[PDB]
């Protein structure tokens, strides 16, 4: 969860993000145009709503040399990892969200078909989710519709240039 006192101290944190059992934990911050050496840090893509109401929001985990990484992200990639890390849950806008992961997959971070946050339109999102699942690596069936809110997770994959890792999340209530 997140403090009206956390935010006190840090004002620039807009939320937080577990995934259980994972080292996946960490404020959410957001800048324009895309105090955390320690913890890390998951930047909100400048073009979402702080306050997660868009249909996919798309959140980054930059790899820097030395400092903080976000290893657990790639761990995804192993089917059983996949299958015994489901739950989560996040914080944001002063409310306790949960989060069931449905998908994993890799991707180049050019690929615009899927880092195109903020998207609406009921046949248009339903469009963007359809393709999303076509391309997983790994993925479980689950009750999926534009009207929810979903999170893409995305942070660098180091074997591959330009490749990236990213989770997918479900919004879900408690």
């Given at each position: ?88 849950s ?7 969200k949960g989060l ?72 879900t209530?408690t």
């Open positions: 969860s997140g403090f009206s006192k956390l935010q006190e101290l840090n004002p620039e944190v807009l939320g937080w993000i577990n995934v259980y059992g994972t080292n996946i934990d960490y404020p959410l911050v957001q800048a324009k145009d895309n105090e955390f050496a320690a913890t890390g840090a998951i930047f909100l893509d400048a073009r979402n709503n702080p306050k997660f109401e868009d249909f996919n929001t798309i959140i980054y985990g930059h790899h820097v040399e030395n400092g903080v990484m976000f290893g657990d992200v790639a761990k995804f990639a192993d089917q059983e990892f996949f299958d015994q890390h489901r739950y989560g996040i914080y944001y806008n002063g409310v306790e069931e992961i449905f998908e994993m997959l890799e991707v180049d971070a050019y690929d615009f078909n899927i880092y195109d946050p903020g998207i609406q339109g009921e046949d248009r999102q339903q469009a963007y989710l359809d393709h999303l699942l076509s391309v997983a690596m790994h993925k479980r069936d689950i009750s999926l519709s534009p009207s929810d809110r979903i999170i893409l997770l995305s942070t660098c994959f180091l074997d591959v240039t330009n490749g990236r890792h990213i989770v997918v999340a479900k919004i209530d």
